[PDB]
Amino acid sequence: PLPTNHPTQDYARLIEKAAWREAIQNKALALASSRAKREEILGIKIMGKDSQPTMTQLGGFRSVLKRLHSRNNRDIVTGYLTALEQVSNRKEKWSNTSQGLTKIRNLVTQENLIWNHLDIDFSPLTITQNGVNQLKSELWAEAVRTLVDAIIRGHKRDLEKAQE
Amino acid sequence: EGVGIDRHFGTAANGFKYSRAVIPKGSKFKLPLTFDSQDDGLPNALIQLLCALEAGDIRLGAAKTRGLGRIKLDDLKLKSFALDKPEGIFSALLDQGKKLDWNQLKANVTYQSPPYLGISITWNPKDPVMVKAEGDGLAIDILPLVSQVGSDVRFVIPGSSIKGILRTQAERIIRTICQSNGSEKNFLEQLRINLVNELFGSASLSDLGKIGALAVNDCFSSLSMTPDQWKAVENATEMTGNLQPALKQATGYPNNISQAYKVLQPAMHVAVDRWTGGAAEGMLYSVLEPIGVTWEPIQVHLDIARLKNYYHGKEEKLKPAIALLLLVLRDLANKKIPVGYGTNRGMGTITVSQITLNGKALPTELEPLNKTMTCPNLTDLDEAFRQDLSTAWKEWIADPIDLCQ
Amino acid sequence: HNPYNFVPALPRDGITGDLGDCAPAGHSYYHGDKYSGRIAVKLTTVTPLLIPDASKEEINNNHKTYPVRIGKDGKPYLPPTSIKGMLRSAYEAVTNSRLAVFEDHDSRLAYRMPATMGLQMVPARIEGDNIVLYPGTSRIGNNGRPANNDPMYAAWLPYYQNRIAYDMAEHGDHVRFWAERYTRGNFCYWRVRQIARHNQNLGNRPERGRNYGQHHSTGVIEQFEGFVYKTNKNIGNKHDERVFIIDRESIEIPLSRDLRRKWRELITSYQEIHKKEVDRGDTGPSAVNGAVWSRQIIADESERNLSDGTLCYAHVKKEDGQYKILNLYPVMITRGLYEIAPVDLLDETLKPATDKKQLSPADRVFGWVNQRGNGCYKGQLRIHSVTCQHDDAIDDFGNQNFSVPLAILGQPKPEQARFYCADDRKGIPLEDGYDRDDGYSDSEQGLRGRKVYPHHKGLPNGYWSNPTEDRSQQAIQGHYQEYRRPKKDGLEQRDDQNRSVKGWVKPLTEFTFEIDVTNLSEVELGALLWLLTLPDLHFHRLGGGKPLGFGSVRLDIDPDKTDLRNGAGWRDYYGSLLETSQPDFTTLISQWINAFQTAVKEEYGSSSFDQVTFIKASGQSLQGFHDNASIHYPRSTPEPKPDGEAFKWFVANEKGRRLALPALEKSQSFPIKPS
């Protein structure tokens, strides 16, 4: 492992972030390709020919999660979930999901949970001393955003395939 | 996010959704050019290129015809290093170069563009015009699409949306003149038609692929908001609760709910049961209608040089394409081409105040196109020129052949 | 006259033409034989028009006050979607199209069953996949009543007027108890004397009980096991809960899915009808103070489920030599269900379309999205450019802070079968005098059709003037200001039953709008232009408060701004960049309207167009009623009383002549006393 004060640590961190980003995105796209994992991670499901919830609820959430730049912004995402479940007309749209609003809240509130779903071994992808902890904190919001977007994309691709 | 529209049913064609990530408007990057001169000057074509960059004439990236790619150059500096000479080599090593005033050379030669016709359409929403935002809001279901424009957000009609409505009207006019039916054909077949495959382009399928000679800008609202002001609207949970502050802020009327709602108006829609007369609850939905959003003029660019290459330089073939383009602009000015969401549902009709036709390096026979029109029926165009176009148009109609040979 | 009625929706089997179901013309080109272009429409209001701005609704004491929606110029913004829905429903009437909005009519509807029906119910418990009857010491008579004046099937647990605590029992307690046979009137019952949980010992045999007023002891004393069936003190005379005497006699009967889905529908009715009441925090029935909500109403979703060990009443009869269980009920005198769901009373040719091959005329003209599948169609008709021509068009009744409180706009209650059910599929009213059980009863019955609000003909001068004055307690020319809530004790009844408007669009104010239409056939165009060129004094009904009289409007085409051509005419138009003649549609409008009229005659079997039943009915709606009987909701007094007691007419009707809502074509008025 590279000493923390080492002058090439900025360049090493560049290669690490690239390797982690590609690993996260590939593993996300694997997960999102399967109906069972999409339901496992976000609760969203396809019931024959209509999606649970409707794609406008997924678009609504996806337009909120794009504001998750850091763990400090996470109250915006859990804030939005509060206003969803605060009112029955919104709550009832997600209530036909596999517990999706709790699953979304867990994915955003728990810093570990994204990494458990991705289940990537980052030891081959890190070389900086304490690199994993620094990269996990740095890439957490991006990894969450990556996975949620992949799942929603995979869901809507199958949703269209069911309708085509 | 976007979708193809089936030409027979008028609805989102199955399998023709698309998504594209875009660097936002107002983003900056360096002009990063070095030129090695082998003679004691600066080349004309390179001076012309820099003038074109300052004019905004050069497009970069994907979706050039369908909303994107426009760039403009500012802060242009030219530094000279006489590498033929000791003073210039040591200047290159040490002194950051001899400054050229660009304004001198830029004045000392005429800028020459390749042929194009600019169309600038001054328009206003006759009824609220919006593209739908893909996500529902909390208080409002159907929200206007916004985009980042510099440090602000503005409401946007993507040039993809204006392109597709114009393409649809072009194709409808041709299929009427031919009495050709697109009900049987699939979406890709429904698009392949003569004169529209050149003005709007054909998909590159192995090749009939063509880029459109006609390019449409993203049209942004004259209104703008801070990003957190719009998030306050998106996050608003109650239509008569925290939405009213958020809309008052975003429209710029924090103390006047009347003036705020003359710009952005929340609208409820309810479906009524036919047997009982009851609100078919669950079929209640809400739209934030941009009733008083002012918009910048629609910028359409016809690449006349692109058409010439398709028609093999002979400008007589241009006249049927120009004729179609004018017939489409006549429909756009006569409110026959609604734009965006909800066009049969109370939105999307536009007024056209003015069409400015701004040709650069046009051929003499199309030179009457250099005009500002305010009659919707194009009677500001010379009648001898419109009859001239009308004759070439009628000849093509008689044999609706593929110009492009 | 009732403020609504129905144009009958006729079944559309063998309808073969443009009025039939058809593949839509499409949007790809202007067909040479079908007409496209712009119709300019002048709309002028005849009565005041309500255009609520829900985006600016003020709310106080849960009463909502709506201003008029205004556009960027401050003139009233009449929304194109509001005109579209007015036009669509009127179009869909006169073409006999599918019903575009037919939502959530697949459950049976619920109503109060006869009070005599409670005698026919036996205590029951579900035990697994069986409902098991528990008649106790008595035996089930053939009609379902306790046979030959043996005692009531359940013990009576004195709970309120006299109290028998253990040695207080709750619903579903398994209990062991002494009971004594007690007598009142024509009947007798087992009075619980003392009670214990099933594990405990109930003690020695009690002696002769005290006569409790008119309840007289017989001295015949027994002990039983049972379950206490408790419902709360849920009507005023209630004294006793029930104990289902399990110990003595029993009959297991299969619990079919139909019984359990009836129970779900019945209990969801009980719950949903009071959801607003219990959210308001009300503790008891809407017209019986001091009573408390009955258990199944306050119980959760689990009450709908009819899970193992739950207790019910079974309506039973010994027909054909078997104990037939008709229905399961939560109380002795109960809500029950009509036999048939309203979705089964509407023909499949009249239900909303579910395939592109089955698009009706209004699905083609106004467009369609499949609600139960894939499929959609863009409308061939576009309303746009709605411009108010008058500037001072909005009446604010003196100040921007004034408002008129509107009369209560209640929910439509299709469960009143005499108003919403038809006696056949061609939309005839139910016959008068029949039992309420006779609505929604037969598959050969039908729905009344499309609900419409006939124009309030003959409103007197000044009826709408100065509306902040309460004039409703006084006849003026025989009208009683139906649009306004009455005063109560001199103060305005602004509550959550009604709404207020800060203003309305004045009568005689003019709007212009345009209709853009694509590829209409002459029949489809004829229907539309017929609606846009109705004879004098025919009015469309627009916006809100239509049953109060608001929103009657006159539509007529502005011919100079109208430009309709067939695709051959458009082919000539696009054939030139020079100005070209437009064909004068005014020479052809009669042809198209007659094309529509002859198609309606020919496909719907009539020797005249105006004698087609849906045409005849629809005309009467647009025209109103010529007999100068006032339009108002039914009530027992000619004056609208300041209390919401209009149900009193309906209960008088139920005990009286039992009038159905008269056919719209017949123009028959209701009597103020239907006794």
Task: Inform me whether the C-beta atom of residue C27 falls under 8 Å from chain B C-beta atoms.
Answer: yes
- Among candidates B257, B280, B377 on the partner chain, residue whose Cβ is nearest the Cβ of C56: B257
Contact A60 B231 (CB under 8 A): no
Question: Which residues does chain C have within 8 Å of residue A49's beta carbon, measured at their own beta carbons?
Answer: 373-374
Q: Which of A81, A83, A120, A87 has its CA nearest to residue A103?
A: A81
- Among candidates B176, B272, B283 on the partner chain, residue whose Cβ is nearest the Cβ of C574: B176
Question: Which residues does chain C have within 8 Å of residue B282's beta carbon, measured at their own beta carbons?
Answer: 103-104
Instruction: Report whether B284 belongs to an annotated binding site.
Output: yes
Signed CA dihedral, A158, A159, A163, B5: sign only: negative
Task: Inform me whether the C-beta atom of residue C569 falls under 8 Å from chain B C-beta atoms.
Answer: no
Which of the 8 DSSP states describes residue C438?
A: G
C6 and C617 Cβ atoms separated by less than 8 Å: yes
- Beta-carbon pairs below 8 A across chains A and B: 42
C278/C283 Cα distance (integer angstroms):
7
Question: DSSP readout, C4-57?
Answer: -EEE-----TT--SSSS-B----SSS--TTSEEEEEEEEEEESS-BB-B-GGG-
Rounded to an integer, what is the distance from CA C575 to the centroid of its chain?
54
Cα distances (angstroms) measured from residue C178 to each of C164, C191, C198, C212:
11, 8, 12, 17
Technique behind the model: cryo-EM
C119 and C152 Cβ atoms separated by less than 8 Å: no
Question: Which residues does chain B have within 8 Å of residue C574's beta carbon, measured at their own beta carbons?
Answer: 173, 176-177, 327
C533 and C596 Cβ atoms separated by less than 8 Å: no
Signed CA dihedral, A73, A74, A80, A82: sign only: negative
- The residues that bridge with C189 in the sheet, in sequence order, are C182
Q: Tokens 């066009």 sit at which residue?
A: B343
- State the first-to-last Cα distance of chain A, in angstroms, to the nearest integer: 52
Contact B172 C28 (CB under 8 A): yes
- The residues that bridge with C336 in the sheet, in sequence order, are C111
- State the first-to-last Cα distance of chain B, in angstroms, to the nearest integer: 36
Question: Which residues does chain B have within 8 Å of residue A84's beta carbon, measured at their own beta carbons?
Answer: 138
**C-alpha torsion C461→C465→C466→C472, nearest 10:** 60
The residue of B186, B193, B276, B349 whose CB has the most chain C CBs within 10 angstroms, and thus the best one to mutate to test that interface, is B276
C519/C525 Cα distance (integer angstroms):
9
- The residues that bridge with C359 in the sheet, in sequence order, are C22
C629/C620 Cα distance (integer angstroms):
14
The residue of B3, B19, B134 whose CB has the most chain A CBs within 10 angstroms, and thus the best one to mutate to test that interface, is B134
Q: Residues, chain A, total?
A: 164
B378/B357 Cα distance (integer angstroms):
11
Q: How far is B112 from chain C (nearest CA, A)?
A: 31
Signed CA dihedral, C59, C65, C66, C67: sign only: negative
A3/A6 Cα distance (integer angstroms):
5
Question: Which residues does chain C have within 8 Å of residue B239's beta carbon, measured at their own beta carbons?
Answer: 54-55
Instruction: Report whether B366 belongs to an annotated binding site.
Output: no
As separate numbers, helices (DSSP H) first and strands (DSSP E) second, chain A gives: 8, 2
Identify each DSSP E strand in B64-151 by its residue range.
66-67, 78-80, 98-100, 116-125, 146-149
Token representation of residue B52: 């074109």
- The residues that bridge with B225 in the sheet, in sequence order, are B153
Q: Which of C598, A80, C71, C306 has its CA nearest to residue B264?
A: C71
Residue type, C482: E
Question: DSSP readout, C387-427?
Answer: EE--SS-EEESSSTT--EEBPP-PPP-TT-HHHHEESSTT-
- Among candidates B179, B261, B345 on the partner chain, residue whose Cβ is nearest the Cβ of C32: B179
B121 and B332 Cβ atoms separated by less than 8 Å: yes
CA angle C480, C485, C487 (to 5 degrees): 95
B230 and B151 Cβ atoms separated by less than 8 Å: no
B131 and B340 Cβ atoms separated by less than 8 Å: yes
CB-based contacts of C447: which residues, under 8 Å, 6+ apart?
B275, C9, C342, C345, C346, C420, C421, C422, C427
Cα distances (angstroms) measured from residue B231 to each of A85, B140, B221, B234, B244:
19, 13, 17, 5, 13
Question: Which residues does chain C have within 8 Å of residue A163's beta carbon, measured at their own beta carbons?
Answer: 374
Chains that touch C (3 or more CB pairs under 8 A): A, B
Signed CA dihedral, C265, C268, C272, C278: sign only: positive
Q: How far is B361 from chain A (nearest CA, A)?
A: 45
Q: How many CA atoms lie within 13 A of A51 on its CB side?
A: 27
Q: Give backbone dihedrals phi and psi of C58, rounded to 5 degrees, phi first.
A: -75, 135
Contact B14 A164 (CB under 8 A): yes
Asked if the peptide bond before residue C559 counts as cis, ω within 30 degrees of 0, the response is no
Q: Which of A115, A101, A123 has its CA nearest to residue A144?
A: A115
